[PDB]
Amino acid sequence: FLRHYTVSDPRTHPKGYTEYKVTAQFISVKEVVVWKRYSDFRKLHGDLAYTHRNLFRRLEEFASVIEERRKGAEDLLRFTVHIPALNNSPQLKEFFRG
């Protein structure tokens, strides 16, 4: 009961792409870990933006660049913690497979 995210420990995969460790922690510690490539965060972001765009349009009807990537993903994730519209998002909850 108090969410905290980190994105860390990038690691190359045998298939070539870099993978990140996404850590979700809950403290009054329960932690959930998944591995994600930057393209996953891109899809997530896109799904959030389109979900809220359409919510809106429905209401109104009636090579250290990967550090930049790691930080971007992490920031984006942190952004949702204290916005219940984003925090409670289904897309967010599916994002954590394992």
Add this chain to the structure above:
Amino acid sequence: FLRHYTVSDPRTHPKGYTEYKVTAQFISVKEVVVWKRYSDFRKLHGDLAYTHRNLFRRLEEFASVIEERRKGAEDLLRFTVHIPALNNSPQLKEFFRG
């Protein structure tokens, strides 16, 4: 744990405006009742629409007409029940004063 809204029993106020009974029920019954004029629902609606418009624009940065009114308010309220982005809304929770 299973939300249900109704808007009902319109009643004129000594000051002239019509007032509605908003009933929020929770069943596995816990019910919360508030009284609201149609202008309140208008403000609510406007706040939801603007909250999600700006969420979007932030993500992408990096005299039976009163029956029509009653129904409109009720429909609008029901709309949020199974959208966690709307259901968990702070504006929604403030809406229930008493």
